Amino acid sequence: GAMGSMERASLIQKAKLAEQAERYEDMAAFMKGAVEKGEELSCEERNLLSVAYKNVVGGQRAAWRVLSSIEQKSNEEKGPEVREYREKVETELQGVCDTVLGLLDSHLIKEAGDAESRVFYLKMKGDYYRYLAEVATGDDKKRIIDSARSAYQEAMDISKKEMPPTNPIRLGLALNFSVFHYEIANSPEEAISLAKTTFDEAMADLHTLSEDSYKDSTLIMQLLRDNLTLWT
Amino acid sequence: GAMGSMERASLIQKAKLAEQAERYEDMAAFMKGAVEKGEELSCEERNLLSVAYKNVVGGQRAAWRVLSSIEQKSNEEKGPEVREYREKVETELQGVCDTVLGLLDSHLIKEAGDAESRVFYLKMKGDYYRYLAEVATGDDKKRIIDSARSAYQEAMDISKKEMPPTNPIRLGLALNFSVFHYEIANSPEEAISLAKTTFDEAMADLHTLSEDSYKDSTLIMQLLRDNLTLWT
Amino acid sequence: AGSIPGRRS
Amino acid sequence: AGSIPGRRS
Numbered sequence: 295g296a297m298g299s300m301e302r303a304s305l306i307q308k309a310k311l312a313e314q315a316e317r318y319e320d321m322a323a324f325m326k327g328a329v330e331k332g333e334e335l336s337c338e339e340r341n342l343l344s345v346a347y348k349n350v351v352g353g354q355r356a357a358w359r360v361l362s363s364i365e366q367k368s369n370e371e372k373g374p375e376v377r378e379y380r381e382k383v384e385t386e387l388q389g390v391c392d393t394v395l396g397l398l399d400s401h402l403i404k405e406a407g408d409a410e411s412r413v414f415y416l417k418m419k420g421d422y423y424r425y426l427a428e429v430a431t432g433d434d435k436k437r438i439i440d441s442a443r444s445a446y447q448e449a450m451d452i453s454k455k456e457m458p459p460t461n462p463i464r465l466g467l468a469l470n471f472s473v474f475h476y477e478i479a480n481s482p483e484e485a486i487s488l489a490k491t492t493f494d495e496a497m498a499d500l501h502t503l504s505e506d507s508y509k510d511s512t513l514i515m516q517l518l519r520d521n522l523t524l525w526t
Numbered sequence: 527g528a529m530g531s532m533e534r535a536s537l538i539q540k541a542k543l544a545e546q547a548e549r550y551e552d553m554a555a556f557m558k559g560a561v562e563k564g565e566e567l568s569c570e571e572r573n574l575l576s577v578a579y580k581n582v583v584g585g586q587r588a589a590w591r592v593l594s595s596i597e598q599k600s601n602e603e604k605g606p607e608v609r610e611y612r613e614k615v616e617t618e619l620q621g622v623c624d625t626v627l628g629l630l631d632s633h634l635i636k637e638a639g640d641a642e643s644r645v646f647y648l649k650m651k652g653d654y655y656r657y658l659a660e661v662a663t664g665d666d667k668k669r670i671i672d673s674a675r676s677a678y679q680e681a682m683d684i685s686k687k688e689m690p691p692t693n694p695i696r697l698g699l700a701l702n703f704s705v706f707h708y709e710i711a712n713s714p715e716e717a718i719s720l721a722k723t724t725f726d727e728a729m730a731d732l733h734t735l736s737e738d739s740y741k742d743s744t745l746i747m748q749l750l751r752d753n754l755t756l757w758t
Numbered sequence: 759a760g761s762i763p764g765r766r767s
Numbered sequence: 768a769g770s771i772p773g774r775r776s
């Protein structure tokens with residue numbers, strides 16, 4: 295495509311430079327170009343792809359929330375501008391989510407056979423449908439929510455069969471799916487139960503880990519605990 | 527142009543919303559559209575224009591500095607990618623500076639007759655030539671530096687004739703011109719002298735000010751003092 | 759509530 | 768060295 299004339303290795307190198315320069319839109323474009331080369335991604339490359347788009351959509355989500363709050367307060371007649379601009383940001387956000395979902399569907403997920411890669415991509419699929427669900431209101435909102443649920447569920451089923459309970463991808467997946475239950479699916483008890491069981495099963499497997507693996511698993515356990523403290 | 531079909535007042539309103547949402551590229555596009563309506567800008571509108579572009583170029587400058595530092599360290603052969611990507615960011619930065627300079631030349635400066643508006647725009651002109659000078663290396667670098675100097679100098683001459691020494695635009699102009707002398711023109715003694723004389727003449731006029739004007743003038747005086755502490 | 763960050767920081 | 772910020776903050 296747009297990056298079609300640049301070497302895969304140069305796109306990866308430039309994505310790393312873009313992250314150091316905090317140029318996340320560039321980073322996402324370089325990683326989209328890398329995915330479109332058609333080869334599978336390594337662990338490090340999957341993290342570059344996720345970092346790039348998570349930062350781009352994260353900024354859009356924060357702007358959408360600011361605008362949505364102003365719009366709800368307005369509803370003196372300020373005219374159509376707040377709604378129009380919220381709609382503009384919302385369309386942009388939806389476009390980025392559609393782009394990421396399109397990369398996952400063409401063809402990252404179908405080529406991912408190892409449990410670590412397949413879980414990583416299905417967790418991303420759940421996350422980008424979740425971001426679509428945060429702004430959805432029309433006839434497809436139920437279907438968008440169900441698409442997030444289904445992706446997270448398939449990732450959970452693989453992770454519980456193929457990864458230890460301290461694996462950081464398994465932990466991050468459970469963290470994000472618990473956020474889905476609380477914030478999207480109106481299922482706070484499911485969210486709390488998932489976070490608690492995940493935390494406790496990870497705690498019981500920490501004894502198997504090296505110092506560096508322990509650091510990763512306990513970092514995500516603390517995120518689970520932080521949500522549990524907020525929710526209880 | 528691109529915003530040609532949106533009302534001036536809607537562009538201004540959306541620029542204010544974009545700032546609240548930290549969407550500075552949008553903010554700059556809305557303000558470019560407002561300027562292109564052809565009317566003069568009010569004080570508040572001039573500040574929206576400056577905030578928008580100062581934030582956009584400020585992010586580009588920070589990214590260029592990160593990339594330029596990596597490039598200088600590289601000069602193992604990492605291939606052409608660091609230089610190529612620094613060049614990409616540099617071209618983008620130059621393009622934004624050219625856009626702002628084009629708005630000032632067509633036709634903000636020529637229509638600005640009041641000292642406050644004309645000084646504001648000439649200070650901006652000096653600043654965007656200064657940002658061009660930060661990345662310049664070729665046959666035009668001397669001419670770019672001189673263009674910044676000339677704009678700042680004309681602004682200084684008007685400000686000293688028409689504004690009190692505590693006026694915040696006069697103070698910010700002197701602050702920025704002193705940064706020009708230190709960082710661009712290799713004239714640290716001129717930079718120190720300008721900052722000191724500006725600070726002292728403002729101090730001696732604080733007694734004339736209301737509480738709110740005093741707050742503005744002392745805030746910029748502290749910036750002058752912070753630079754003097756760094757430079758001495 | 760927080761979701762997973764892109765980097766450990 | 769610092770130049771003028773876009774807003775007082």
Ligand SMILES: *Cc1ccc(S(=O)(=O)N2CCNc3ccccc32)cc1
Nearest residue numbers: 462463466510513762763764765766
């Ligand atoms: C979804 C997910 C979960 C973990 C990882 S990681 O590679 O183990 N890693 C990098 C991303 N953030 C993070 C936080 C805490 C501990 C480890 C990580 C990647 C993706």
Ligand SMILES: *Cc1ccc(S(=O)(=O)N2CCNc3ccccc32)cc1
Nearest residue numbers: 694695698742745771772773774775
């Ligand atoms: C270049 C310049 C200088 C002052 C101003 S201002 O409108 O007085 N104002 C807003 C921008 N930043 C600022 C810092 C301290 C005190 C006042 C201000 C605008 C533009």
Ligand SMILES: [Ca+2]
Nearest residue numbers: 334405406407
């Ligand atoms: Ca495969």
Ligand SMILES: [Ca+2]
Nearest residue numbers: 566637638639
């Ligand atoms: Ca006029």
Ligand SMILES: [Ca+2]
Nearest residue numbers: 477759760761
């Ligand atoms: Ca949340």
Ligand SMILES: [Ca+2]
Nearest residue numbers: 709768769770
């Ligand atoms: Ca500086």
Ligand SMILES: [Cl-]
Nearest residue numbers: 378379382540
């Ligand atoms: Cl809009």
Ligand SMILES: [Cl-]
Nearest residue numbers: 308610611614
């Ligand atoms: Cl490039």
